[PDB]
């Protein structure tokens, strides 16, 4: 990415350092910090250092026993039948010297601590959201989640809301968010697995192109290999190699790689939609033409070959749409279907029966490399009836393109 | 040009002087100057001489160790492992007498000096936007940036604003802005790299033709050299030669050249859209026809050859549109696609298969040098669907030109 | 499966435990627990601990004489003709720490005990609906069901209502619900069979794909065997095998099977629409084209091959729609109808007479594997006239797909 954009890989971080430093400051009594956090949230202002220092002290449960080894990028977290805590994934402590805030002494050593850390970590998910109508949906889910731990829990934070949106910029807050999610990913049956309500969005954060690669594989019904053969643009291909560089543990479920942004392993993600704009445009457009309900809202990237990427997306979508490969799966014994009758269509004109990129490429030549009146129809019929489209979306682009 | 238009190249500046003079006036000490600027903002009136003097006193972090030698236009800013400051890029001082204003002594030495330089430098970007709807988005973003350095900062300057709009007209203020931006561009991973929030708009300032040139390359997927061959109007070519003059370090990222305006290296930028009006119009129009989301709002230049530039833009956009060069990028070993093409279609009236300007020019001559119906239909379909077009823009021009 | 989502089967719970542990709360008299529940409901706050304890005390009617042996997953609930109670389907009792609440001692030791368990268990079904319009319909029916026992019954809990929604998240509450329903499914003629007003929704909870399979069988009028042959997609086939895994007692009317989720037998149901999305989409789409009044509100799954599944559903629905298979059912002596005359019709273009999948697969091949104009017209007539469809529903998809 020449300047600013130089992609940083998860594996390259561990070449330089063998530990993730978590700067938890002051480290001074859970009872006092609980009073700081409880009253702080209720007051309308709470220091992030207190939230951090409380979150650490409340989550030091050395729970969850491994039945299989734990290792990622050369870091051996656990071996065989070891019992580890959520903070064995990180390192360090760095006292500084704190500052005053509103405190409740009425706060409980018992009643709080079983829902409060869940409430704080949940504010991470709510803060990232921007659309106010949808912010409430996660807030109400969070209200329920803590109400599931008794107390008839009623949201502590007033409608001020400014305070927890800035939390996502704290280097140490997000490291606990990543530690919690990674931990209860290994122990998904653990008692405190519910704490993953707000931390789930830290996993595969800023990896939209890998999500797009997955979306496209599901809508087409093809393998990762077969999808890759259907890439017809160079920039998409160049971006594909960038994504598929070996030794990054992108297929490992138990890995540090999903939290590369929140752990601070990578300043610039390789798998972000912004760093793969050609693949993201092509992938999401093709998927939308193949009846995706999510692709319509996808962000239309800037500085890409719109015209060329559209022709490759249309041909790919038209190949999947015209070749709904239907065959027998079950038979009442004997009565079986075996095809290959004729298989030779209308002279030079008939489109291929399979989904072979090469055959469709050869067919495209015969059509003088220009979208067929039927190809334009297919896309036109997929983009019409789309309503409530927003500016600079794949949906708006696609409808403006093919609906006239 | 001819009159006041004669362009000034950044290279020709350093032949006259070997230093960029920053007139930092008066030494009233950091503690006194902080009170002036802090209250002056709260009150709604502050002297720029104070703002400049404070910005100097706070930004003398002689931090950032150099990785390689830094030289631009024969000015050796640093060598190998030198430690340079922000004001090592410039030089000078010139003290005299100063004005009285409001002061707060409640202002702390270290506390204010972390977020405040960002707030002052950030107002450069804010005060240079006109439309109030977008000014608030930048203002709130600036507020969000200061809330990261923290202390729950609230905008000091009231709704009156305007006070910081005239700051960009002060030559010394712009020199600090350009020095901060050039510095943290080299030191990307610096603690205070977040200061580039407002200083970013100083980089490649009034160099919109080079931005237009770069935009056309990204949309077409063609190289700079290939885009250059597609220039069919001489005025555009004469403007291109003006832009591509040797010895200007325009491809050098670590250079003085991106801040020719704010450092005072140039009075007339050779890279402005007003100085390259034929290339700007033609380049943006071609981009718009190839589905650019930004080209629609591009300003329409005055006193240019509209009819010729439009016809050349159409021939270029039609060529890129019709010839989306699709080729197999990945394969399962053995099954490979090779175009035996036959490289011929419907006689003399079949459009060229590639993007060779020579092949398209010959085809255009055979069309009697008149845009074909399909050519006009390509442009009509591209411009229709454009809604909310503003007067005197390339977007609105293109719709009136082709939507018939 | 693969990660987090791996399906858990009913039979596999009973391999590791022979008990379904119901942790019933601290023993504190029926009479006292009546007061807590009665006052706590009408006041607006009542502990689920008290709700569960009261439900145990009031529902201990050992009134159910077996007429046959009782066995599910090797567990012998009963034999020959012995008398059992609701809580013979579970086990255990666990104490913790009790909590103060509002009570009324004016409550009758006997009179309230006849309708209150029905009322508490009924709120389970009420708390599962989001739409307030239908949510009231269930509340009115619950009031009328309690009015049948006691003439003077008025709904206890105020308009707040967000109190009993959280009960469904309590492990022990749902176990009572599942135990109550399984008991009165056996003893249908029992005096307290009315208690199933609210507990019925525990039955086949998160088993939507089995209901989808049942729906498709009823709408087409084809056997489970014949429906399975009409599956033309591999993913749907994979899901069908997952649903039809042996020894899970899915055909057994009286089993622990239907109450998978509420008994804690499985955390991820293999019969859900979420885990069988391709079968769900295709099954519900085919049903809708065949005049299902319920299919138009079925949830549209994400990440599935809409294009392939739509074509498979259309061919299937078009086959059922074209082949009515009308035959004489009653004859008035001698005068019968034998369909032997005419077994074949016009061209390679005439659709098959019967509903044999292999015959239609052959016919589909000869139509170039593209839905015919008439095939597309059948679907258009089946979707137009559908009014008021929600977003992301099968009905919206089908109309948007076929209504042009």
């Amino acid at each position: 990415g020449a300047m600013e954009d130089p992609v940083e890989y998860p594996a390259d971080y561990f070449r330089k350092s063998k530990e993730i430093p978590l700067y938890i400051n002051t480290t001074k009594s859970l009872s006092d910090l609980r009073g700081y956090v409880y009253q702080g949230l209720k007051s309308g202002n709470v220091s992030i250092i207190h939230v951090n220092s409380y979150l650490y002290g409340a989550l030091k449960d050395i729970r969850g026993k491994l039945d299989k080894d734990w290792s990622s990028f050369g870091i051996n977290i656990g071996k065989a039948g070891d019992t580890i805590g959520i903070f064995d994934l990180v390192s360090l402590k760095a006292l500084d010297g704190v500052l005053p805030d509103g405190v409740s002494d009425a706060s409980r050593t018992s009643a709080d601590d079983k829902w409060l850390p869940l409430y704080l970590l949940g504010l991470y998910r709510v803060g990232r959201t921007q659309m106010p109508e949808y912010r409430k949906k996660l807030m109400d889910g969070l209200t329920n989640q803590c109400k599931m731990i008794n107390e008839q829990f009623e949201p502590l934070v007033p409608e001020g809301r400014d305070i927890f949106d800035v939390w996502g910029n704290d280097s140490n807050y997000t490291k606990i968010v990543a530690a919690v999610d990674m931990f209860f990913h290994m122990f998904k049956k653990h008692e405190c697995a519910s704490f993953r309500y707000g931390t789930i969005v830290s996993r595969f954060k800023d990896c939209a192109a890998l999500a797009t690669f997955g979306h496209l594989c599901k809508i087409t019904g093809m393998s990762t290999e077969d999808v890759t053969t259907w890439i017809l643009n160079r920039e998409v291909a160049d971006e594909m190699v960038q994504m598929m560089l070996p030794g990054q543990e992108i297929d490992k479920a138990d890995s540090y790689m999903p939290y590369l942004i929140d752990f601070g392993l990578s300043s610039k993600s390789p798998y972000s939609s912004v760093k793969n704009p050609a693949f993201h445009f092509w992938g999401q457009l093709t998927a939308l033409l193949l009846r995706s309900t999510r692709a319509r809202n996808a962000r239309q990237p800037d500085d890409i070959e719109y015209t060329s990427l559209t022709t490759a997306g249309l041909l790919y979508a038209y190949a999947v749409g015209s070749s709904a490969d239907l065959a027998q799966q079950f038979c009442v014994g004997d009565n079986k279907y075996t095809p290959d009758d004729s298989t030779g269509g209308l002279t030079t004109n008939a489109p291929p029966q399979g989904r072979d990129v090469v055959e469709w490429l050869g067919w495209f030549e015969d059509q003088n490399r220009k979208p067929t009146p039927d190809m334009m129809q297919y896309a036109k019929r997929a983009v019409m009836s789309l309503q409530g489209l927003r500016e600079k979306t794949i949906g708006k682009y696609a409808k403006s393109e093919f609906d006239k | 040009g001819a009159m006041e238009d004669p362009v000034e190249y950044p290279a020709d500046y350093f032949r006259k002087s070997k230093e960029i003079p920053l007139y930092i006036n008066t030494t009233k000490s950091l503690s006194d100057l902080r009170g002036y600027v802090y209250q002056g903002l709260k009150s709604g009136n502050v002297s720029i001489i104070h703002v400049n003097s404070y910005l100097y006193g706070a930004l003398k972090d002689i931090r950032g160790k150099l990785d390689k030698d830094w030289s631009s236009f024969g000015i050796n800013i640093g060598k190998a492992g030198d430690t340079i400051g922000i004001f090592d890029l410039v030089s000078l001082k010139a003290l005299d007498g100063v004005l009285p204003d409001g002061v707060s002594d409640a202002s702390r030495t270290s506390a204010d000096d972390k977020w405040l330089p960002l707030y002052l430098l950030g107002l450069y970007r804010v005060g240079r936007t006109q439309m109030p709807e977008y000014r608030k988005k930048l203002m709130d973003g600036l507020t969000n940036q200061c809330k990261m350095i923290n202390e729950q900062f609230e905008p000091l300057v009231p709704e009156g604003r305007d006070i910081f709009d005239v700051w960009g007209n002060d030559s010394n203020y712009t020199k600090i802005v350009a020095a901060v931006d050039m510095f943290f561009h080299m030191f990307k991973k610096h603690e205070c790299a977040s200061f580039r929030y407002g200083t970013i708009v100083s980089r490649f300032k009034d160099c919109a033709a080079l931005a237009t040139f770069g935009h056309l390359c990204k949309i077409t997927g063609m190289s700079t050299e290939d885009v250059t061959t597609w220039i069919l109007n001489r005025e555009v070519a004469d403007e291109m030669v003006q832009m591509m003059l040797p010895g200007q370090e325009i491809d050098k990222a670590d250079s003085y050249m991106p801040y020719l305006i704010d450092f005072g290296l140039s009075s007339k930028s050779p890279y402005s859209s007003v100085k390259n009006p034929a290339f700007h119009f033609w380049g943006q129009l071609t981009a718009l026809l190839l589905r650019s989301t930004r080209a629609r709002n591009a300003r329409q230049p005055d006193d240019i050859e509209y009819t010729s530039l439009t016809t050349a833009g159409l021939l270029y956009a039609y060529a890129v549109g019709s010839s989306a060069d699709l080729a197999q990028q990945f394969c399962v070993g053995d099954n490979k696609y090779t175009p035996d093409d036959s490289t011929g279609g419907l006689t003399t009236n079949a459009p060229p298969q590639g993007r060779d300007v020579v092949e398209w020019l010959g085809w255009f001559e055979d069309q009697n040098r008149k845009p074909t119906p399909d050519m006009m239909q390509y442009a009509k379909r591209a411009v229709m669907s454009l809604q909310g077009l503003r007067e005197k823009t390339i977007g609105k021009y293109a719709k009136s030109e082709f939507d018939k | 499966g693969a990660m987090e989502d791996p399906v858990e089967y009913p039979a596999d719970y009973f391999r590791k435990s022979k008990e379904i542990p119901l942790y019933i709360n601290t023993t504190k008299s029926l009479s006292d627990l009546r007061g807590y529940v009665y006052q706590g409901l009408k006041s607006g706050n009542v502990s689920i601990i008290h709700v569960n304890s009261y439900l145990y005390g009031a529902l201990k009617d050992i009134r159910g004489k077996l007429d046959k042996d009782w066995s599910s997953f090797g567990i012998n609930i009963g034999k020959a003709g012995d008398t059992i109670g609701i809580f013979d389907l579970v086990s255990l009792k666990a104490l913790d720490g009790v909590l103060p609440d509002g009570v009324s001692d004016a409550s009758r030791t006997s009179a309230d005990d006849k309708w209150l368990p029905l009322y508490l268990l009924g709120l389970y079904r009420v708390g599962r609906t989001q739409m307030p319009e239908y949510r009231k319909k269930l509340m009115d029916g619950l009031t009328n069901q309690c009015k049948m026992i006691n003439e003077q019954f008025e709904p206890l809990v105020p308009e707040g209502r967000d109190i009993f929604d959280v009960w469904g998240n309590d492990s022990n509450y749902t176990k009572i619900v599942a135990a109550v329903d399984m008991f009165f499914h056996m003893f249908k003629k029992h005096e307290c069979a009315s208690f199933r007003y609210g507990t019925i929704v525990s039955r086949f909870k998160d088993c939507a794909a089995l209901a989808t399979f049942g729906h498709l069988c009823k709408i087409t009028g084809m056997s489970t065997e014949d429906v399975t042959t009409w599956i033309l997609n591999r993913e749907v086939a994979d899901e069908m095998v997952q649903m039809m895994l042996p020894g899970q007692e899915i055909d057994k009317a009286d089993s622990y099977m239907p109450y998978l989720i509420d008994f804690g037998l499985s955390s991820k149901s293999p019969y859900s629409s979420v885990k069988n999305p391709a079968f769900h989409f295709w099954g519900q789409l085919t049903a809708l084209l065949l005049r299902s009044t319920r299919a138009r509100n079925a949830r549209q799954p994400d990440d599935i091959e809409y294009t392939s599944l739509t074509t498979a559903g259309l061919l299937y629905a078009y086959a059922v729609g074209s082949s009515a298979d009308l035959a004489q059912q009653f004859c008035v002596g001698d005068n019968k109808y034998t369909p032997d005359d005419s077994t074949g019709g016009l061209t390679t273009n005439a659709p098959p007479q019967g509903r044999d999948v292999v015959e239609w697969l052959g016919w589909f091949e000869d139509q170039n594997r593209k839905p015919t104009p008439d095939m597309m017209q059948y679907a258009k007539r089946a979707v137009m006239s559908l009014q008021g469809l929600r977003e992301k529903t099968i009905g919206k998809y089908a109309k948007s797909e076929f209504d042009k």
């Binding site: 979306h215 594989c217 479920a253 809202n297 | 990945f330 | -």
Partner: peptide, 30 residues
């Protein structure tokens, strides 16, 4: 033009499907 490779990722097909599931959860509407 260039040969396909597994690139050490054999559980890649399963992984990308899991990534899109989490991506669907972070989709804002209304």
């Amino acid at each position: 033009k260039v040969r396909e490779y597994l690139k050490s990722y054999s559980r890649l097909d399963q992984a990308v499907g899991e990534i899109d599931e989490i991506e669907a959860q972070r989709a804002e509407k209304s």
